[PDB]
């Protein structure tokens, strides 16, 4: 019922369609992509756009869901809330923290909904082990270490260059930040990386350290230069929880300081299921921002990653 325009072909269309599609809660009715040809009829999508004024013109839509070059964000958040739509924008949110900043501003000048597209923090496995360690099953959290690898990013014709939103950091932080800040509602007092910067390029790779509220000591690993899988362990004073790519997961491992080992599984058809039934509730239900993706969450990942580097001198 709450209709979507969708900026980009990107690869996601489908998935984010697909996953509105389940979500039962709304409907994608419109996209576009430079090409008026391509994307064609299909879906059947009622109607299609190579320009985002004209997409942006079509009184019908509630909300637009921008998938673009990340550095391309910001323009288009703030052309659509400026035409009166909500806005859905996907990690990451903007390049800067006061692009950020604005958005929010400006998206509680017009009273518009804005919710930045996840970072993990909708699917139903996030809210299981949340709980599981609100309630001792690992004892107190002392450490961290999360790894995500991406050796196939150069299908990603832009991701070598910094001036695009290109880079390790840039891509893969968000996840993490967002994720960390959620399962423990913890905020991130230090952080700190290095990285490794081929000439005249964005990050290769990175790993960062993070220090949360809550004293847990973090680290993290994005990488394009090794083939490993994308997992995350948590260690706690009476066992570990091993968490595979935590942000698309339907699972993970409890190990018991030895009493050792449970899995712990979920149901889930669609990783953007959720969140897209939950934007549109917060667009029925008449809501401005999400209590669940808060603008606080938002803006501490935008910070901390414009942070990063600016302290690599890396910024612009």
């Known amino acids: 019922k709450v209709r979507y325009g969708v900026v980009s072909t990107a690869k996601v269309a489908p998935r984010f369609i697909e996953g509105v599609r389940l979500a039962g809660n709304g409907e994608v009715v419109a996209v576009s992509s430079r090409t008026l040809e391509s994307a064609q009829a299909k879906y059947h999508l009622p109607k299609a756009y190579d320009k985002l004024e004209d997409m942006l013109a079509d009184e019908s839509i509630d909300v637009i869901y921008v998938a673009t070059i990340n550095q391309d964000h910001y ?90 939103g290109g880079g390790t950091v840039h891509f893969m932080a968000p996840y993490a930040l967002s994720y960390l800040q959620y399962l423990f509602d913890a905020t991130i007092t230090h952080a700190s990386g290095t990285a490794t910067f081929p000439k005249g390029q964005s990050d290769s790779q990175s790993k960062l350290l993070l220090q949360l ?68 509730q917060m667009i029925l239900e008449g809501q401005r921002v999400s209590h669940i993706m808060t603008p606080q969450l938002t803006l501490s990942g935008v910070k901390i990653i414009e942070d990063l580097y600016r302290s690599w001198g890396k910024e612009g």
């Open 213 to 280: 509220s809550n004293g847990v000591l973090v680290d993290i690993f994005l990488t394009t230069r090794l083939n490993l899988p994308h997992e995350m362990i948590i260690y706690g004073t009476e066992g570990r929880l091993i968490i595979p790519h935590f942000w698309k997961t339907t699972h993970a491992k409890l190990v018991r300081n030895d009493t050792s080992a449970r899995t712990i599984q979920v149901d889930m058809v669609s990783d953007f299921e959720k969140e897209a039934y939950h934007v549109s």
């Open 75 to 164: 323009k288009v958040a703030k052309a659509a809330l400026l035409a009166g739509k909500h806005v859905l924008v996907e990690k990451p949110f903007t390049l800067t923290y006061d692009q950020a900043n604005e958005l929010f501003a400006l998206a509680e000048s017009c009273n518009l909904f804005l919710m930045e597209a996840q970072k993990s923090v909708f699917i139903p496995m996030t809210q299981v082990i949340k709980k599981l360690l609100a309630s001792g099953e690992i004892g107190e959290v002392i450490s961290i270490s999360s790894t995500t690898a991406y050796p196939n990013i150069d299908h990603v014709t832009w991701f070598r260059e910094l001036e695009l």
